[PDB]
Structure formats: C-alpha cells, structure tokens
Symmetry: C3
Subunit: 543 residues, 3 copies
C-alpha cells in the first residue's frame, strides 16, 4: 500500500507536526501548511533549500521583528500569510469621527492609545507634519519601532498572495520577479507595508504590487528602492488601493541610501487608488552627486529620464500632496485628484506631457502656494480645475490647452494658454441679462478684462431684441469705451468719439477716420488719414 499511497497522494507537511519552522521547511516537498500560530524571534531565518513550495497559511506568524525566508525556488507561492506583532504600541489617529483631519499637535497628541491598528506609531516625519508635536508627545510614544515583518531575501520568482496582518510589513530584499498579489488589507507597522529593496546586487526587476488593499502604517504603503523595470517597464504598482498611509500611498525613494542610489526607473503606476494619506498620494520623484546613478553633469537635479508608465490614478483626501514627481521626458495621463489639503499636483518636471488631468478642490488648507505647480517647460493638454470649493496653477514655463472649470482667471499663471482648434462657437448665457466673450491680457492686468463683446437684452425676456457692444478698458476701468449696435432697439450704431481735439498720433491706419469733439464750435470733426498716409482734419457734423 505504501508504494501506492506514495504515488497517489498530494505531498504536504504541516507546522503542527514540527517544533520549528525550519524543521517543517526541511521536511517539505510540495506543500507546506501553516496550521498553528507560530511565535518567531526577530531574525529567525528559514532555509527552504531551493525547493519550489506552495505555502498555505491558515494561522499567524507572531513576533516583533523579521521572519526571514531564504532559498525559496522560483515558482514558490505563499498564500494567506498573517503577520502580527507581540507588542501593542502607542498610536496616534490624526482624524475625527467625522473623518476631518486634525492638524493641531495638541489635538493629535490627545488621540494617543495602545492599539495594533486604527492609527500609527509617530515617527520623525510627524514632527514636520504636526509642528510642535515632538515636544508634546510623551516619551513612551516616541521612537517606537514595532513591525512584524516577513522578509523574503534574495529570491527570484516568489509570489505572496492574500497577505494580511496587524502592525505587519512585507519586505523583498535583493529579489527579482517577485509579486505581492491581492493583499488582504494588512494593517501596517512602523516600516513600509510592501517594500522592494534592491540596494545590493543588480537593480530590482520584475517586482510588482498587483491588486489588493493596504491600510495605516507609519510610512508609505508601497515603496521601491533601486528598481529598474527596463524598457519593458517590468515592475510597479497596478490595481492597488492604499488607505491612510502614515506617509504616502506609493513612494519611489529619492537620493543616496548608504553608499548607493535608491532611485527607480521604468516602472508602471497604473489603475490605482490612494485615499487619505497623511503625506502624499503618489510620491514618484527621484531627486531630493548621485553615487551609483547618473551624474549631475549628465542629468541636472529633477531631470532624470525616469520613464515611468503612469496612467489612470485616483487620489482623494491627502493631507499632503495628491500627485508628486520630478523627471524629464515623461508622459503622464488620466490622473484624477480630489479634495486634498496640500497641492493636488506638485510637478518638478521638464519637457514632459500631461494629458487629461483633473485637479478638483485641492490645497484646501493652504499648505502650498497653489493647487498645481509645474517648474519646467511642460505641455498640459486637458486640465480640469475647481470643484465646489494663492494661485490655482503656477506653471511659468508651460504651455496649456483645454482648461475646464470655474477657475478664477487671476489665479492662472502659465507661459502660454491657447485653444487653436475650436470650431464655430456659441456662448450660451444662463441666469443673466447678457452673454459675454471677454478678453484679458495678463501682461496688462491679471484681474481686469481689457475688452469684450457683449450681447445685452433690450427691454425684457421675450422682447426679441438685444444690443451688441464692443468694449475697451481705459483708466483701469473695464468697458470704459464702447461701440454699440441696436441699443434700445434703435437699429443704429452708437459710436464713441475722442472727447477733445484728437492728436495726430491717435489715428493708426491709412484710409481711416477718427471722429473728435471740437467743443468751441459744438462740432464733430474727423482726423482723416488719407489712403496716401497724409493727415487732414475735416468737419464731420455741425449745428
């Protein structure tokens, strides 16, 4: 029977039969079932002997610190893992029962409680976020470092599916072609919830966060260090949700970490949602002179050819910035940012194109100077501004087209704004006695319109009559001077004349006349510039 049984049954060992995880790992052939809670000590390392295993978790891994998995064969899968710390730390919860953010350090300190979730352990970044909190926090709430972390080290082709936990963290160190799939809402600890760190060895490649949701945590939900997906953009974050990150939803590290670069290139950031991060929705910058990376002489600060594939992202409720990045030669599309306390978008980009961007009700707490900032020479095609709620857009070197929304024109600063390809136009006016097409030369005034074409009702609704007027600003008084057609249904043109003797230089073109007033004779004269360019003054109207 043994011979037969050996050939007809699925192989799997279960933790309940062993004293240690390493013993179970050593006995494993195909499957490994975690069927009893396991308390691990920080730094406990398991060697899987290069075996391609299917680890099914139906119990918890309990401990503060890292449980290190090494030598898992390519194709190994871990499903249902649940990390939980032994320590219950002091956490702050910077939001109210009405989901309003608390910005006052004293109000935030008052939220302190011991819990493994529904808040996060304060870190030094909170000292910046809630000014003065550093001196108000009790010593037992400062410098905590609790995280129950599953560390997969130097493995290739290992996937973690439906992971969860309390004060949990997942770290892929020196890995490639690894994925964090369908995370079942782990509640984060002190460190990043899902981190792909490749500071040693080759640049990380093929590392992804696919689907799932992540909550809380003291720092960023998902983070990458020294990863390069190559031209194929093999790596990144797709289809994920981040809720209430202590720092940002997604963060590609910037600057030097250790003696090398922590920057990232060629990754995808698509079809994702980030809600209520304490800092930013997406922090995709690379610069904060670049050991291990491109020299500043080759690519200036904030001008690295990051080449990320960025599309279809939604950010809502950030206490910081909705979407931030730097880099040169980027193409970004379909970004929607709503209800953010700081800038909806903070772009330190150059020679980049932004298509179909919607920044709705951001910088609601005046944390920044504008709702959207772009430093370099970029192109914006389709920009929706203003929802239902300091410049709105400050992109001094950018050319923009297609802004929609109830924007205050005086709060727009761009290099060039144009609608070169509209067809025949109709201006439809609702709730007013007139329709208008205004012109504003920002060089002259950002607050006053320099001229206009209006249509005003004569009499009342249903009169079937209106008058058209062409205006010009004078003495900083909009519409000071105007020509009217059909005022009071008179069917004639009312023409403005120079109130005094017209100077020779008032007339511009040949074969034109400019009427002027000669008060001493109660006459209307006309300065005429003959077709030959010569000036002559004629009498136009008299008593």
């Amino acid at each position: 029977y043994s011979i037969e049984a050996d050939k007809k049954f699925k192989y799997s060992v279960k933790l309940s039969d062993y004293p240690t995880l390493q013993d179970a790992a050593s006995a494993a052939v195909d499957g490994l079932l975690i069927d009893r809670d396991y308390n691990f000590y920080g730094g406990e390392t398991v060697d899987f002997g290069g075996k391609v295993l299917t680890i099914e978790c139906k119990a918890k891994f309990i401990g503060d610190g890292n449980l290190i998995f090494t030598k898992l064969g390519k194709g190994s899968r871990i499903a249902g893992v649940f990390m939980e710390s032994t320590t219950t730390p002091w956490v702050i919860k910077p939001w109210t029962d009405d989901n309003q953010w608390l910005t006052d350090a004293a109000a935030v300190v008052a939220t302190l409680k011991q819990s493994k979730t529904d808040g996060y352990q304060p870190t030094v970044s909170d000292y910046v976020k809630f000014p003065g909190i550093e001196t108000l926090l009790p010593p037992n709430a400062k410098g905590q470092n609790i995280t129950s972390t599953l560390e997969i080290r130097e493995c290739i082709g290992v996937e973690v599916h439906r992971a969860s936990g309390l004060m949990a963290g997942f770290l892929f160190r020196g890995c490639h072609f690894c994925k964090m799939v369908d995370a079942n809402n782990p509640s984060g600890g002190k460190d990043g919830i899902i981190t792909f760190e490749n500071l040693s060895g080759d640049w990380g490649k093929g590392n992804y966060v696919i689907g799932g949701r992540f909550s809380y945590g003291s720092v960023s939900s998902a983070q990458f260090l020294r990863n390069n997906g190559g031209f194929e953009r093999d790596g990144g974050v797709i289809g994920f949700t981040s809720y209430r990150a202590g720092e940002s939803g997604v963060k590609t590290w910037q600057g030097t970490v250790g003696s090398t670069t922590s920057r990232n290139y060629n990754l995808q950031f698509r079809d994702s949602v980030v809600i209520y991060p304490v800092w930013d929705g997406f922090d995709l910058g690379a610069d904060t002179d670049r050991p291990g990376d491109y020299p500043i002489t080759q690519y200036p600060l904030h001008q690295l050819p990051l080449n990320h594939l960025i599309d279809n992202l939604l950010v809502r409720g950030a206490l910081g910035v909705g979407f931030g990045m730097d880099g040169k030669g980027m193409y970004v599309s379909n970004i929607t940012v709503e209800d953010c306390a700081g800038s909806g978008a903070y772009l330190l980009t150059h020679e980049s194109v932004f298509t179909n961007i919607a920044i709705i009700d951001t910088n609601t707490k005046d944390f920044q100077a504008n709702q959207i900032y772009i430093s370099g020479a970029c192109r914006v095609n389709g920009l929706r501004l203003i929802g239902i709620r300091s410049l709105t857009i400050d992109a001094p070197n950018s050319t923009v087209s297609g802004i929609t929304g109830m924007v205050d024109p005086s709060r727009i600063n761009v290099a060039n704004l144009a609608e070169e390809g509209l067809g025949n136009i109709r201006a439809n006016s609702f709730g007013y006695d007139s329709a208008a097409i205004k012109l504003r030369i920002h060089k002259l005034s950002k607050t006053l319109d320099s001229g206009a074409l209006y249509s005003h009702i004569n009499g009342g609704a249903g009169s079937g009559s209106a008058y058209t007027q062409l205006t010009a600003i004078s003495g900083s008084t909009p519409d000071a001077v105007s020509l009217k057609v059909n005022h009071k249904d008179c069917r004639g043109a009312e023409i403005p004349f120079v109130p005094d003797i017209a100077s020779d230089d008032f007339i511009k073109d040949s074969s034109c006349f400019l009427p002027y007033w000669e008060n001493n004779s109660t006459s209307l004269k006309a300065l005429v510039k003959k077709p030959n360019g010569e000036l002559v003054r004629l009498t136009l109207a008299t008593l």
Copy 2:
C-alpha cells in the same frame, strides 16, 4: 507507515465518500472536495465547526431554495461552486435576434419559454416596465420564485471564487469581510445574483464583489443592504461586469426593509461595466422617517452623506437609466454612458461634484424628460453630450463648465454655464462660407441667437478676401441689424443708422454719437451726447 503518511500527505475529504454534505463537513480538516453532484433540500444547513477549510468544487449543488453554510472559519475559501435549480421555469426574453429591446407587452409575452437561462422569470417590476403585461401573462408564468441559492450565514472572512450556475444566487447574510471573486458568469434566478444583506447585527463591512461577470436574473446582479464601508471605504464593487440584469447592474437598497434601514454608505463602485440591464446600470440611491438611520430632520430626503467612492464606470444599452443616485456632498468621476433608452444619468444630488462625465445617445426612447437630470445645487466639470442620434440636460441649480458635442443649445437648462479659463481662441469653420461666434441669452430666447461675430467669404474660395460682421437681433429676427467691415472687399465699414428720428433715450454713453435718418431733407443727422452728458442734434451728411 501510517505515522509517516499522516505527516506527509495533504488532508482532504471528498463528498463521494459520504451520504450527506454535513457528514463530509464533519470529517473535513483542511480540504473538502465536491466531486459528485449533490441534491439539497431547501433550507439544508451545514455546520462547518469553525474550521478554516478550502472547499474545491468539481460538481454541482442541485436544488430549488437555499443551501446554508454556517460556521466556516475566517480564511475559508470556496472555489468553483455551481448552483442549479431542479425546476425549469417559464422565462421571458425582452429582446430580438438583432438585439433590439422589445417594449410591447404582447411582444414580450410571446417570448415565453421554459429555460434555466437566456431570459428571466417575470416579477412585479415587469408589470411597471412593460405596461399591461400583468394581464397578458398566463398564470403559470406569474409569481414564480425559482433560485438555487448558496447562503453563507454569519461568517467572517469567507471568499467565494469562480462561482457559476443556472438560476443561481449567492447570498451573504450577516457576514463581514467576505468577497465574491471572479464569478464565472453565473446565470441568475429570481433573487439577486450576489447579495450582501446585513439587516441584523452590525452594518456589513469589508464585503466586496471583485471581478467576474454575471448574467440574467430577474432582479439586480449585485445588491447591498445595510452595509457601511467606513471612512476607509472597505467594501463595494470593483472590476465587475453585469449583463442583462432583470432589474439593475448594481443596486444599493433604499428605504426601510422590515423595521430597519436597508441603506448603504461608504462603498466603492469602480472600474465596472454594466450592459443591457432591463432597468438601470447603477442604482446607487438611498432614499425612495428613517428607522435605524439618520432622521429626516438631520438629513432631508435624497441628502444623506452617502460618501461612496465612484470612478471609472461604463454603462451601455440600459432599457432604463444608465447611472442613478441621490445624496449630498458626493464626488463622482469618469463615468461613460452610451446608448440608453431612458436617461443616461438621473441625479437627485445636492452639493456634489461630477467630473468628466460622458452621456452619449441616451433617452433614445423618450422614457424620461431628459438625457441628464440633476436636481440640487451641483457642479459639473467636463460633460460630453450627443453621439450620432425633451431637454438634453436639465440641471436648474447646477453650474457647468466644459460641455463638448453637437448639443442643441435650446435643449440645455442649467443655472450657470461658463468657460472662465480658455486661452487665445480660434474658431475654425469647415464646409461653410463663413465662420461664426454666436451669443445666446437664454433669458431672452432659448432658440434664437441674440448677436454674432461672423466672417464671410467675399467672392469665392481662394479670393483672399472676407468681410466681418457684428450683428444684433431685433423683432425676433436674428442678425437683423449689423455693422460690416470689408463687405465685397470695399475696405470700408458699413454702419447702420436709426431709420427715423432718434429719440433722446436711444443714446447710452457720453462722448458718443448715434446717426439717424431725417427723411424730409434726405439728410443723415447725429444725436450726440457730449462729453458733459448734454444732448445736441447735429447734421452729419447732406446732399
């Protein structure tokens, strides 16, 4: 050997070894394989003893009524389940071989056949949808109630994957943190295909429909009762497809059910597609005085703070409304609705923002009064109307910006329409001898333009000449009065004058003159309002 075998093999029991499902459930330790069809009786209840099981289905559960699973441990997974009724009911199929909807009750009654799919059992809502069908339906086709339902009751953390069936239904009753994942196109029965009902106990939370597709069914594909995802929006529908729902694709219940509220809050509805529902694509309203919910004194009807996260939805072919909802303080974005028989969008919302909405060819059967209706004071930023096919938009209290499409201006009714931030403009005219920029004051007339700025060709194409004309409406005749520049390439301005003696009140501003006709002397006069405001009549031109 037994000792060894017990430690090296994967545990799983299979239904073929037991007489009843409960017996198999009682023997189960890790896996449970459904390897033989099982006929269950309505109300048959299985107690899983709190075990965390992996139930793999490779056969059907056959029966009319509910098969109730209870006490499944957190982390349990059911995959491949297939529900099928024992009864083959009478179903109607309200569409033709060309996929045209049938709206005539007699034509619909004629489609009657006995089948477990490709149609649905008529319900009372059909009496409303196809007027008169109630009296035409034969008695054996009325009041049917066939559904083979898998009911998961009061469980936490249970997921159902790749479910399918015929006349199938899936009901999570009193559950939390449960998911219906990658449904493999079950064909629905009388009840909802996937329902999360939490009328008793705590409000449902963490309940999701993730991916998959659902077809037919007499009522809504996915439905939620008394679920609240909290600030974290933990719950909802993401990435799913609904085809031909007897009622709606997605429905959040409204009103009182029993002695409590069936309403829902804080859920996500994203990246989903609903095609051909008999009623609506998405029915996300909460109100139809609110036992178990907010009092009408706190939040008026249709003004509950639902706070759903709604983004990236596509609806096509609804016989009813594409997208419907109510509520206050909502942010909705990226909705595309095409080819609907009733309104594309029916919004009973207040103080809400709608960004990038596309309503293309809706209300094609004039079921409603408009293509898009918004009752309250909302903001619309980016609205695309008209495809290739009664007001188009009726949002009396809303402010709109960014409408694109061949809309008939007379079919627009909003509180305010404006393009405050366009740049320098160019109106490009194709196929006509002129380009135009028209002005229409809706208060004066919704059908006639009150004035215009035109450019007309002089001679023919390639003449290199055109004349510009500024017009005004008079006597309800558009462009009745006008000033022209360069008519017939004359290089002069043609000026209109009052056809008779100008009355003193015809002139508006100081330092302006208004020419008028004095027929009895064949003279042109000029009513002049001197710079000092005084009126004087001068002779302008004579024989």
Copy 3:
C-alpha cells in the same frame, strides 16, 4: 489504514513516477503535478479522459512544436505551465540601448544573435516593415519556425493560469469558455503567444485573455479567429499588457483563412496596455466575397457590424499604428495613444462614435499621411491632439467637437467642427501684448485667418488701457482692414472708409451708410442705402 488513508488524503499523481505524460494523465483523478522537466515531441497528444483535473506545473515542457492536450473536463485548470523550445533560433532586435527603434534594414540585420528571447525570428512581415531586409538576411536567419506550443484542443471550460516560457505559444483550437489568466510574461516564439482559433465547428465564445503580460514573439501577442461573443460580449481581452510584439498587441484576424471567415464579432477590448509593438497596438479590423460570413452585398467592405465593446486602452511606442479598426455602428471610448511612429489611429469606420480620444505625438516618423484618419461618416466627441513634438487629422466625412491641444489649424480636415454649447467665454492671453479671438474659414484659406477680434495693450503693462480691433482679410493679407476702439487711449472709434468712389454694390443692407473717399475734393462721402432700399450719395465730411 488504507481505507482510512483513501478517504482522508488529497489525490494527486506526479510526472516523476511515470515515463510518459499520457501515463500520468491516465492515472490522474484530481490533481496532476508536473514535477520534472518533460521533453515532448511535436504532435505529442495527451488524452485526459474527460477528467476535471487541476494540473500544477513546477517544471518545464521542453520541445519545438505542439504538445496537444485533449479531453480535459469542464472546470480543468492548468497553472504555472512553462513552455521552452529545444532550438535556439536567430533573432533580430530592432531597437537600440536607448530604446530607439532601428528602421534601417542594414542596422537591423546587424542585431542578429542566437537567443530564445530579447528579440524575435524574422518573418515575411519584416520584409515589409524594414524594406530590403529580405535580401540582407543570411539564409540561416530566414524562414525559421520555432515555437514551443501548448495546444488545448476542442475543450470547454479550461483555464490556463500564470503561464510562462521561452519561444512559447499557447493555442486554444476549437475551444469555448476558455481563459488565459494572469500570464506570467511568456516570451513568444514564431506564432501568436495566445491564440483562440475557431475555424472549425461553432464560432468561438467565452474565450478570454484576462490580465497578465506577454513579451516579444514574431507576430501578434493575442489573436482571435472566428470568435463571436454574442450580444453579451462573452470574450475578449481585459486587463492585459503586451510588450514588443513582432506584429501587434492584439489582432482580430481579417479575411478568409482556408475556406472560411477568420473574422470576429462582439468581443471586449478593455483596460489594456500595449507598448512598443513593431506593428500596431490594437488591430481590430475585420476586412482586408466573405465565405462563411456576411456577403459584401449586405455589408460593404469595412462596414461589418463588429459591435466590439472597446474602452480604456493605452498604447505607447508603436513603430506602426497605435489603434486601428474598421466596421460600422461602433461606439469607442477612452483611448489614449502616445509616441507612435505611424498613425495614432487609423479608422476605416462609418456611422461610429468616438468619445474622449487622446492622440499624443504620433506619426513621428511620417509613415502615414496623418496622426488620425477616419474614412466614413463618424462623430468624434473630445479629441486631444499634440504633445511636445502631413495632416494631423483627416476625417473628411466626420463631425468633430472638443479638440484640445496646440494643433496647427491648417493641418485639420473634417466635415464639420463646432462648439455648440459653451457658456460665457473668456480668452486669457499670456506672454503677449494682446489677446485674440480669430476666425478661419477653411473654404477660403486653411492657412490664413479671415478676421479677428483683438485686444491690444496701449502703452505698457499696468497702463490700465487697451484698444479693441475688429479685422478682415483683404488681398490675402490677414487683418488688412480694421475698426479700432480706444487706440492710444483716445477713447474714440477709428473707422475705415473705401479708399475710392464706392460702387453701388458695395453697400449691403438698407438703413446703412458706407463712407468713401472723394480725392478730388478732399471730401469724405457716404453711399447711403435708405430705409426704403434706395441709394443716395451724401457728403459726410469736408474741409
């Protein structure tokens, strides 16, 4: 014990216990584990006896040619399969280290190397793509046909999950309700990476490519032949990524293959990304007289009622066309195409609607005549053109609305362009001394504006003064003739007059006067058309 063991353990056989795959297949009951590499010969066929199996792959299937799986029961699942050829062919790599495409045949021939990835085997389509390469390629690099293909034949309800490989191919022949799910980046061979071919038997239905990523391959990544998803659109490509396809990312075949039609209907193509295809991003055309399909007399060429559901697609870096299709009565939405060498969109469609299309920096290598081409009578609602880089759009029979971007108006050709529903307008000018609203009648000139309304600064910034001018083109000189209001802050209107004796036909309307110059008396005259229509010439101004 045997009795007990037989009832409590999971059944699974493993390849390591058998000499051939068929032997393992015959012994299988529930699971089948591929735990050792298996070298198969081309055409090796395995009969699974109608069993519903779960095949778990933890090793490779090695061989050139097809490994044919037949008679798998409905519900069977294959996970982790890895196909690899025995031959290492000669492949070309038409791109540089900077990711620039190589278009020169000699430069491409120089990339030749023997490898199972990072390039592809040249085919006859390359002879067209890189002109002259046919004669430059060494004979050992021509006509190669290496592909290690898993062929699933005539099965229903079989899913392949997380497949991978080198020179790999996956072919579903005569299958229905089959899915290729979460492909783990297989590197393609000579044939399509995932193909659903239904040339024999019923039209394919329920066949999908869900998620995953595919790379390289000589032809298209995903391809369909004779599939019809029905009204329910049961089939297609959703959520996938294609990188560097030798031909196109997605291809629905066109024309006759064998003695039947290879065309496809009613499929979904959504939420997908295609990057760097050598040919096109999406090739969704059906026509290239139609055996096995609609006769040309019923539906003319390129006018088949394909009815695909197309939404949310992104294409970047195509050496060919970004998005291409034909058909009549289509609704297409939310397409974003960036940085393509050939046309961003090539549409041989009629009576179709395109909503929210963004074509950014395409036809960068002038491969085609335009960035977007539409042949038939279509409607475009929302079109974003120009990023940071020959007509731009040539849609002679289409009506368009909502173009945004820095488009050159002279490069637009459409049947009608209009913005019928804008509200009150403001033209904001940045960086210039004037704001402008120009009018261009394309029938008159596609390069010159026929008239304009300008506002120009008087003096300098902060002067609080500007003049408004209405212009008209004459003698092909834009703004040749104009009326000004407030030039040099004079507060009067400068009026142009006919430089010579005005001919009777110069005046257009009654009750209007046209000033003209009478040089011989240094007088300004006025041709007057009295309110009764009669002409009279009066003296207007004199010395």
